[PDB]
Symmetry: C2
Subunit: 158 residues, 2 copies
Amino acid sequence: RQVVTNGSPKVELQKDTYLVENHVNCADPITLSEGSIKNKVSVRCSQNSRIIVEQKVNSIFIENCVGCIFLVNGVISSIEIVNCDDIKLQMTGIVPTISLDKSNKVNIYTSKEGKNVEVYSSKSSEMNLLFPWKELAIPEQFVTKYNESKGKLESMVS
Amino acid sequence: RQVVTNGSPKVELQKDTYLVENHVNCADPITLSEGSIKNKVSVRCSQNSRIIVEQKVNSIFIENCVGCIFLVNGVISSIEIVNCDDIKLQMTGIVPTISLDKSNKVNIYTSKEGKNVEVYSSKSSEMNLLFPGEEEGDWKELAIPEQFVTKYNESKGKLESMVS
C-alpha cells in the first residue's frame, strides 16, 4: 500500500514539534539527534524508512506510515500510532502509554525497564507486544452482553 | 459511500441458503416470507432498503450493505455482519449471537425476549444496543465499547485487556 507524499523529505522544528515527513524508500535512517522532554515528534507520510529518535521526548505521533521502522528512546507521555501498516517499534527506555488506531501489523519491542506499557487499541489488527523475544498478541475481538441486573453493557476479551 | 453491485436485484434459493442481493434504493421493503431453521440467509451489496425476514432461520450473513434496515424474526445461532455501514437491525424473536466486523454506525434493536444477545465486535465503530423500554417507541440506548487497554501482567505471565 502506497503513501502519497505532501512535499519533499523534511525534518524540521516548528514551535515544539519535530516534524518528520515524506520519507520514501530511504537507504539511510533519518536520525533525530536533538530535542528534549519538551518536544513532540510527529512522523507522517513515510514508506520503507527507518527513523531513530535518540533523545527522550514528551510524545511521539506516527501517522500514515507504511513499512517503517522506528527506534526510540522513550517518552514522558505516549506514542500515538494512527493509520499505519507494517510498523516496527523498539524502545531503548521507558514508554508508559502506546495507542494504536486503524492500524495493522504493528510489532512493539519493549525494553527491560518499560515492560509495563499500556497499549490502547482500536480498529487495529495483527498487533504484538515483545518482551526481551517473547511475542504476545494483543486481542482484536471482544464480546459484549447486557447485564439486566445492573443496567449496563459488560465486555470481555473473546 | 456507494455500494459496488453485482447483478440483478435477486431473491433466490441456492441449496439451503437464500441469497438476497443487489437491492439499491428500493422504495419497498424486500420480504422473505418462506424458510425454516434449516436455512441460511445471505444479504449482499445493498443500499437504502428495508429487508424483512419472516421466518426464524439458522443464521444470517450480511455483507457490504449501506444504510440498510433489517427486520428479522430470530436465528438458531448467529447473525454475522461484515463490512457494513449505517445498518439498523431489529429482531422480534431470539438472536443468541451477533457478530460485527469492520462495520460502522450499526444499531441493534432487541426484542424483550432477546435482551441477552452476545455481540462480538472487531474493527468496528459507532455500535449501539437498544432495549425496548416500558412503552413502545422507548429504547434504552447503550454504546458498545470500541477501545481497549492491554498491559502485561508480570506476576501471571500474560496480557490483560479491558474497556477504555
